[PDB]
Amino acid sequence: SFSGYLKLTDNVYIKNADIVEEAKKVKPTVVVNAANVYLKHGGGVAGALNKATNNAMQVESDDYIATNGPLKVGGSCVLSGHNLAKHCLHVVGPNVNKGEDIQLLKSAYENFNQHEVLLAPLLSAGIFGADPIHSLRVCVDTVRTNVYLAVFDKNLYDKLVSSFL
């Protein structure tokens, strides 16, 4: 199972790790993708997860969008986890760099509550522009299921742990 995680709360765990390498080692039931409404996995966590699937995640995502249309900001969809997980939960956190409502971050984390255990990144962090310290706070105050957070950046991981209330 998951190893080397620091326990933050009853159900939230954190590790300085690349989520792609973490998914390949663990092969969790659910890996969370930091998705956009179009499921266009170009950069950040999405680009890295998609590249690990040899673009199979993007091909599957384009078929999903052709059938269903775009997701809502704060929404999610369950697709295949390919070689990374049983399932991928594509969750859309607000992109602050696109002027999206930061209050949607709580709605985005609520999607995690439909899964008993997940491997996930901090929503809206990185190229999505939100404060990762705020994202971790919303995560621990919203998610009740078991979430294993992978933070790629060592310096950010240290800052998150040392500032955790």
Ligand X SMILES: NCC(=O)Nc1nccs1
User: Residues interacting with ligand X, by CB under 6 A?
Assistant: 18-20, 45, 48, 121, 150, 152
Nearer of residues 68 and 125 to ligand X, judged by Cβ: 125
CA–CA distance from 143 to each of 40, 109, 118, 120, 131 (Å)? 25, 6, 11, 12, 18
Q: Which is nearer to ligand X, 48 or 84 (CB)?
A: 48
Cα-only R_g, the chain: 14
Least separation in angstroms between residue 157's CB and ligand X is 10
Residues with Cβ within 8 Å of residue 130, at least 6 apart in sequence: 93, 94, 96, 102, 105, 123, 124
Cα(40)–Cα(115) distance, integer angstroms: 23
User: Closest separation between CB of residue 150 and ligand X, Å?
Assistant: 5
Nearer Cβ to ligand X (67/155) = 155
Residues 34, 123: Cα–Cα separation, whole Å: 6
Q: Which is nearer to ligand X, 94 or 121 (CB)?
A: 121
Least distance (Å) between residue 89 CB and ligand X? 15
**Residue 109, CA distances (Å) to 75, 96, 104, 142 in order:** 9, 16, 9, 6
Closest distance of CB 110 from ligand X, Å: 21
Smallest distance, ligand X to C-beta of residue 67, A: 29
Among residues 12 and 48, whose Cβ is nearest to ligand X? 48
